[PDB]
Amino acid sequence: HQCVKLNDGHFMPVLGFGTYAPPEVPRSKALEVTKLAIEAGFRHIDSAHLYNNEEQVGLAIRSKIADGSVKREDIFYTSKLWSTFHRPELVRPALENSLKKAQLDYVDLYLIHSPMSLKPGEELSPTDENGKVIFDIVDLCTTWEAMEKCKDAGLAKSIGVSNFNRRQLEMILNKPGLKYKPVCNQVECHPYFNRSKLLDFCKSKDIVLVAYSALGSQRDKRWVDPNSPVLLEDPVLCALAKKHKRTPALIALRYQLQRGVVVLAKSYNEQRIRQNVQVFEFQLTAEDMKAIDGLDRNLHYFNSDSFASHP
Numbered sequence: 003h004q005c006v007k008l009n010d011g012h013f014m015p016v017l018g019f020g021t022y023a024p025p026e027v028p029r030s031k032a033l034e035v036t037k038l039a040i041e042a043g044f045r046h047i048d049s050a051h052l053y054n055n056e057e058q059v060g061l062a063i064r065s066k067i068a069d070g071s072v073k074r075e076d077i078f079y080t081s082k083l084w085s086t087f088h089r090p091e092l093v094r095p096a097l098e099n100s101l102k103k104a105q106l107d108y109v110d111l112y113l114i115h116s117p118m119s120l121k122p123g124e125e126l127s128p129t130d131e132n133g134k135v136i137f138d139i140v141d142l143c144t145t146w147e148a149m150e151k152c153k154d155a156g157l158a159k160s161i162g163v164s165n166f167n168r169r170q171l172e173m174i175l176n177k178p179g180l181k182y183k184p185v186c187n188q189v190e191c192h193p194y195f196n197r198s199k200l201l202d203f204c205k206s207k208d209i210v211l212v213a214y215s216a217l218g219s220q221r222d223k224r225w226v227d228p229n230s231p232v233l234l235e236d237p238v239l240c241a242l243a244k245k246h247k248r249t250p251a252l253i254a255l256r257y258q259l260q261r262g263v264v265v266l267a268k269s270y271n272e273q274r275i276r277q278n279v280q281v282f283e284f285q286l287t288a289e290d291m292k293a294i295d296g297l298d299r300n301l302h303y304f305n306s307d308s309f310a311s312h313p
């Protein structure tokens with residue numbers, strides 16, 4: 003197991019547990035699998051207001067504190083500001099609401115979930131008469147200032163962003179009077195979309211890149227074309243899993259660790275959850291890393307359609 007030091011001095015475990023499940027999955031499952039993830043050795047847990055599970059993820063964390071398995075300081079908990087709450091006066095109340103649902107006094111990391119802003123309101127996915135998502139226009143530098151106040155208040159130990167491109171990161175990094183840089187940029191990253199350019203940019207600014215859909219996404223029918231390639235069926239990943247006596251998923255997770263990327267892995271299955279912690283047990287060679295680097299195909303499992311159809 004291991005951690006990376008963030009640019010604000012805090013530490014982030016390099017393997018994180020992804021908690022999103024689609025709305026057809028009962029919320030009782032998020033509670034159960036987050037306990038399993040902690041039992042298996044995960045200490046970084048990634049949630050969000052969008053996921054409609056912070057109450058269950060927080061109950062799981064509290065349960066594993068109460069049974070003496072971990073202390074609160076051993077757990078790195080992430081939440082995210084949803085895009086209906088970008089207007090600066092909504093940022094601290096959104097964080098306080100997440101804290102009240104999770105029954106936590108602070109989050110380890112609070113992220114701007116997306117640079118695209120949506121109409122303020124109670125709906126996650128506000129839509130007009132024609133079924134189109136209603137966007138909003140917000141100066142994200144003001145959103146960032148409100149996030150910095152949340153860190154100064156102690157409600158978030160660290161603050162960062164998600165789904166930002168280089169230009170959007172530069173807008174923050176170049177803001178006059180910037181007090182805290184983002185510690186991370188959590189973005190889609192896997193061998194079919196390896197983000198090498200953004201990764202080199204983030205390294206030059208001491209910003210950690212955190213990979214999501216590192217196992218190729220849940221292929222949710224709302225947004226993923228069934229005809230897109232299945233990452234875990236890739237022949238290179240399969241050959242490398244055979245060389246190492248591992249699985250394609252483990253190859254995909256270890257790839258990110260060796261290139262300096264913090265990696266998330268969602269699983270709601272006890273055996274796969276426990277399997278993913280084995281990413282610390284083996285190593286890819288430089289040749290194996292070059293082969294995986296050759297898989298890049300600019301394939302995005304997440305695009306603009308992923309803002310719609312959240313009930």
Ligand SMILES: NC(=O)c1ccc[n+]([C@@H]2O[C@H](COP(=O)([O-])OP(=O)(O)OC[C@H]3O[C@@H](n4cnc5c(N)ncnc54)[C@H](OP(=O)(O)O)[C@@H]3O)[C@@H](O)[C@H]2O)c1
Nearest residue numbers: 020021022048214215216217218219220251267268269270
């Ligand atoms: N906008 C954002 O910031 C953003 C976007 C997307 C995701 N995320 C975060 O990143 C997390 C992970 O991304 P993701 O939800 O797209 O899923 P993922 O980590 O790419 O995983 C995809 C699927 O892999 C399967 N899996 C896991 N371990 C496996 C193993 N050892 N062997 C075979 N299959 C395995 C899981 O199925 P089973 O459950 O059946 O095991 C999972 O549904 C999310 O849950 C969320 O926390 C953030």
Ligand SMILES: Cc1oc(CN(C)C(=O)CCc2nc(C3CC3)no2)cc1C(=O)O
Nearest residue numbers: 022050052115116165304305306307308309
């Ligand atoms: C279940 C779920 O859905 C989402 C979708 N969102 C809000 C994103 O920002 C994804 C990336 C994205 N890029 C774009 C540009 C329009 C091309 N549109 O969307 C995140 C999660 C999660 O697990 O966090």
